[PDB]
């Protein structure tokens, strides 16, 4: 198993873990802030997914310092994992194309 597919798999598993820990930590950070909506676990999980994908529905967001910090980690983990998959696909394409040429 080549490095890029291992990394892609590792990144995926890591992202799922970041999503779950982020849903938990967001609820713990946001309860106690008046007006916060990011305060039950199922919808926090939905929120951490829409944050990692940057899908931008705007139905849920953190209002506290630590929930925003948690949100930043989730954004970066999401954007980064997806970028890694692209890099892994590009390594595949570039290698399969060397072969098509002989090299």
């Amino acid at each position, epitope marked *: 198993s080549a490095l890029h597919w291992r990394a892609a798999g590792a990144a995926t598993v890591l992202l799922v873990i970041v999503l779950l820990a982020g849903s*938990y930590l967001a*609820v*713990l950070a*946001e*309860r*106690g*802030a*008046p*007006g*916060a*909506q990011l*305060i*039950t*676990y*199922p919808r926090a999980l939905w929120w951490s997914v829409e944050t990692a994908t940057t899908v931008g529905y705007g139905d849920l967001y953190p209002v506290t310092l630590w929930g925003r910090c948690v949100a930043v980690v989730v954004m970066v983990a999401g954007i980064t994992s997806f970028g890694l998959v692209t890099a892994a696909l590009a390594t595949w394409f570039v290698g399969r194309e060397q072969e098509r040429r002989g090299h």
Partner: antibody
Amino acid sequence: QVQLQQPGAELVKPGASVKLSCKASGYTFTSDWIHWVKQRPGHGLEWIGEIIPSYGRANYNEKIQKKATLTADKSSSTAFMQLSSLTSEDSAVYYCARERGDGYFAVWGAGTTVTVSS
Amino acid sequence: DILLTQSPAILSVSPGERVSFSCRASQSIGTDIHWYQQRTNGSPRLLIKYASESISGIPSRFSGSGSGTDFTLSINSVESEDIANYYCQQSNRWPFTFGSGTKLEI
């Protein structure tokens, strides 16, 4: 089973303090919150505060005079509410209830009748 | 903080009739409303969650409806054991809050 056990009654002299217990049973998860709710005779339900025992973080109703301090003993699955410097206004039934972090109170304790008197 | 208005405070109904408790939220809260029943000197009992979801152990007689600001708890066919105070509660926004309560009377 009885999932939340509370003492039936506490008598408190005005100015003094009392630590109410709430022993939990049944399924306990790291994600559970225990809430506390005050019911003065013949009146409605009043949310006091919440604790997550598997971390010890507690939040409070900031709209009322802060009388309460929430703690939890992971070892004994018991949540405590320390009510301090009480007056007749603090005489009530205090319920604890368990919430699975999904917004509602699935189970309550029988409640503790607190009486502030000499 | 989200205000939950329950009016009227008392509801007088005849046995077997349908009955509807109103719960109105000061702002839009989706379906994030739950309903408790409390009889004379008992603790509150979860009746309905998320505005319409059944709770195991609760008579099918009970149902809920609404979304946004206006929520209704309903009892097909009222009977004596339904005498109680009925409270709604929201989990949309911190802190959780309760409605002021509606007493059922037969």
